[model samples]
Target: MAEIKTSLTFTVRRREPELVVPAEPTPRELKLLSDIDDQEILQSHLAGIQFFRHVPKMRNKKPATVIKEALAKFLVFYYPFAGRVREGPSGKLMVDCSGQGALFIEAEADVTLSQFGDPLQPPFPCVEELLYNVPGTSGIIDTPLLLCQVTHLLCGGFIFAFRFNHTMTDAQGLTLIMSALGEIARGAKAPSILPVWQRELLCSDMTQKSFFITNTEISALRRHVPTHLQKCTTFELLTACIWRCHTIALQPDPKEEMHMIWPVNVRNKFKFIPPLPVGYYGNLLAFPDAVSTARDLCNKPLGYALELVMKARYDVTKKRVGSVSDLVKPFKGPVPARHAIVSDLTRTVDYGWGNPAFVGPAPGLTTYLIPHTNNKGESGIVVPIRLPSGVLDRFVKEINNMLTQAQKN
Candidate 1:
């Protein structure tokens, strides 16, 4: 992987890597991950970081010790995280549950939080170092399920960064594990919501930049929706706006086909029986498509694209979720700038450090659409868009044009 250059600079002195196993005895057996969790497309790891500023009162505490101790405690509940994902004779994925432990590193940086600049946002400078992969420990199979680094900064603040395989859980699942770690770090005996491992319930499954969009911007777009049309979700409005801008920016062949990978989390969508049990963390999402041609996509009224996205959001079923998983369980796949993945990571997470000063994807070139609020409490979204270098300038121009025309009318 190529090293990305950003304005922030810091050197971290890291201690030797070590494993943090479960504090208590856990079932030392194999736990099979659902087919949805084993799909080829999700084999990659997703990395993220939480930056905590120095609080005068919270000084003197050792972040590494506090975090490592909590990891050991949480592993007792999420014991599987401490183990390795193994492959069986049939090629399915499961945890060895050997208690080999998750990979952890403690380090201290020579820089202060202020160096990261005010209004901490994405494209984290030197994010690779913050949540980097430990040598020989990045594999998705026969490897530790969790790898983390807690870097103490000169300013008494620190960064909590980790890279984990997508097979274990979705965003919700990962968040669950992080929250539990915070509880244990705060001196709790166990997580308030214990871990649930019912991977068999259904053989189903399911970052990019902080593109910021304001509620005011969403309001501008929504009012443009025809009076007779359905009210659009903040997400849908943002999605439609981006889809249009990105497409126009690309300037692809007019007849070129395109798609929007609309993800609908089915955690609460199951209607036949009770919804998935709380604490049941795994992959439970649907990727329904809102597709069209570049020609029709860009030329059509923004409402056309908005309606397609809004429709895709609701046009899914319990059976369809399973069917989509089954189809991919056999094979896997993306598009050549033909597909867009707009994720709603529009939420914040907590840890022993209280709320992080900034929480977003690990600094990388990749892009994401996330709901965000600034220091003034003005709410909007931050989308990190990855495009051909030439496309970016045009993309922003198109975006600016949309806002101007929107406000003008």
Candidate 2:
């Protein structure tokens, strides 16, 4: 719960946010989203930032100019993104497909990227400045469905901030389009993967605690995992271990049943006929929730949580994805404290200058797990979790205890 209140040292001067429509006219038609994509929770936008150091190639041209142009071209292929969202049958959302264009803003930050932070993780300062909340542009329907901001740093580097309607696409889909923008920037005649919106065919479809997990630390934790469950993924091991740590720190009611959930990508998981087109970028994801009594979660061996995580994940089948669609019909919310959400932020969107220093979701309650490698070349995962300031110490103590136990046992 440590709120970052450091005074922002730099000022960002921004151009009026403009609508960058497709370079060419796109199909004008209403595209209905899949039931899975219309969840009440998906009505909001998802935001993140990527920091890039100045590159020599950018000497001849401004990064913002190249990106804005590339964005126009990128929209030509992913045209539906340029449209505004509107309600259709049963309050489901459908893209108006008017080609109104996505929102784009260019900015100049007075400071350099290093000034933001050396080892970038979560709790980025002046996020609102980097990703300016352009007036009248943050709504879900009848508004700009895609918003992007590129804040140029004084040192020739820049921070790229983007927000998109979650109902339109998931991380993989959005990353695919962002990468396509880079392809366009590099002077590609066309995107390598053409955007295909067979919306009729399908609809489908992280937070705080920025913990840098080292390979050795991960191995230490794995040492405690039951041999049979030793094959647990880094995602599972860390998620379960952290879940245990939080329970230990929070000490929730012993009798209360707590839920731990994570999203499973269903692109390959779904056994849909015609197999969901090659370039379809729709909301396709499956969330598997594992539940346990707070008492068991805190008292049982770490393996208990690990097994639940692994079990919930592997249990997701074609049917599992469909059940999620049904749950949307009857399901609604999270009360935060009783529920733990660990999501995978594994894909890093590269814009070709070089690998970005950091790429993560906007600050929120859901703990976002990012696959990362530290400066020492030790590969592991880093995560950002949200907890009260008072509980931070206890949480760290619990995590240290788990790691120490991991080494001895």
Candidate 3:
């Protein structure tokens, strides 16, 4: 990989409760957060909320600030000696998404955020957010990305999202802290600190040219298609469909391209020494793409798209995902970018929840991000799904009907 030269690090202190005014955190402040601590930040606020029922409350005050503060603390604690999350062209060790282009479009009385929720909340809570190209005539900026408007529906429990640079943290590392931090927010000490940073110990050697899948597996993987497809695991099939939808959505644009960058855990993927550091951060994952000529893609065999994506999965387990030497390298310089996109499947599913019974796309999100894969919800092809309230309810019904049809096959 060609070297990306920018780097950054900073120091931040917990703010005084009495401090009323909030200033946007500086890149300096963002650098201090360790992956574990940021996980803690998110985990801190995971209680007492209903998924779709919570968005209306977001319209009240700046709750994003609360989430932001917790993140700041985590960054402060891990500024130096951070783990593998930061080995990328972006310098950020977090799977941070860049809010490069997005306009905060207010929902009208006839068009509120709730128009985007599920007609019926799941047993626990769940919602899936897709990153797609925004329509051109909307007068919004035409950045390749669209931080689509958040679909907030209710109060005290809205969905939340933002992009974190992959270099800042990995899935397991992030989720571990999320669980631990949930404990912290509840005012409990994390059971153990044992953070880990043995990157070389966590992956297979790429130089050996080992494969994540066998030749036979690759051949078979290429045959996957999205129909009323019978799937045992929703994550795999859903991702396959998402890749497909992203392809079709780019129909008129020749330059537009979309890819699947799913992150797998390193701890479970490889054989290692005694164990990895208690907590490690950065991109110990992969962002393999399914290149396509938009038009052909809409018409391409689904199996072919899956093959392109699955093959790239190698980047996640390959030791050379990012040289350990580069990742563990000391934080010697300032970083240029402030955000990246990180997705983890664990957040929506806990032992008791059965996949987030009520999950929403991150509210107040400027940079859109998907929160891991949940096995329980609707997946597969892109149907309008369900929009919150007042967003063309008839259309929402139409999307829901499509999901119903997909589920039958």
Candidate 4:
């Protein structure tokens, strides 16, 4: 977490933490302040967190209710992988509920006035900034590694940015939680969160790659991917785009080294019987990095860098990128570097919520990892992402330009 030196620092605190106020919160009351509940609140002290507050009166109750049900869904959904033993530790069964519910609550409360930049401020901070910085604060830690925050940015009268944990919950789980929260907030009966927690169904056994491409994406990929395929997968293309953005965003650093990592799911790689179900937990994914000098990244044509990522992903299938599970297995050691970039495209967490509006690092953290969150109900293929220091500004610029260029193309 980077520290900012400012003369105008502001500190505001109430007598008690709003979530702990003991006052039975009405949806309206909850909107004003961040919240948490259920067994999730009981455990973990609600560390990993992010959220967007409602404008005093335009209370957003559905989002809260959706979180309520998302908690329940996690409990039931992640049951199968609870003690899989082979997958290392007992996974966080209630993916989004405990991890995110409590997390965002604390995360939101820790916000400093500087964390919320005004039009007058130059280096503005977003929800992502707060998330990245909170972990470094005194006596605050998301131990079970259950951290994910979704901020629906209210910039320009729009709602966007719904991000969450890469490990505890995949993209599908995250989206389901968001949509369910939206639905619950909107006054609906038990949200229709169809339990599609069958991990095995979605595990892509690289031995025999299923063109698991959805019909719609397949049609699109068939045209876009193959035309530019050159033997690359959609995942690689996305990585390439990311790498290109990094170069375009960053100031030219000829000697600086940049490694672009992409995660590959290894559930099916274990060669199990009837394949793993959709409810798989923990990180059953590995990182394969494409290292290059800043100059290489800056100079490479967009397609070329993408080709490098394509080759890296292909290398993983051949056991070239080294298994993530294996690398960490023999480690009777402290955790690895807390900051790194890992990406996952197979998160399959989208149970609706209109494909995550945006995905990336939280506001102030250095490492940025995204679990693969495709529309499918799968949860294993998560990406572990980390970003370089002071690179966000350039990164954001590159992404913005990338999006613009992509639209034009």
lDDT of 2 at 256: 80
- Scored by lDDT, model 2 comes in at 0.76
State the lDDT of candidate 1 residue by residue for 158-267, as single tens digits. 99898887788877677777788888888889888988887776564001223556677667777777765547677777778788878888888999887777546666
Output the number of the lDDT-best candidate: 2
Q: Tens digit of lDDT per residue, candidate 3, span 330-354?
A: 2122211211112333234221112
lDDT of 2 at 236: 83
Off by over 4 Å in 3: 1-167, 182-191, 194-233, 253-258, 273-275, 281-283, 314-409
Q: Which model, 3 or 4, shows the larger lDDT?
A: 4
TM-score of each: 0.82, 0.82, 0.40, 0.39
Clashes of each: 18, 14, 79, 58
Q: Give the TM-score of candidate 2.
A: 0.82
Which stretches of candidate 4 lie above 4 Å from their native place? Answer: 1-125, 128-166, 176-258, 264-272, 291-306, 318-409
Weakest lDDT window of 10 consecutive positions for candidate 1: 323-332
Q: How do the candidates rank by lDDT, highest first?
A: 2, 1, 4, 3
Model 4 global lDDT (CA atoms, 0 to 1) = 0.37
Error of 2 at 392 (Å): 4.3
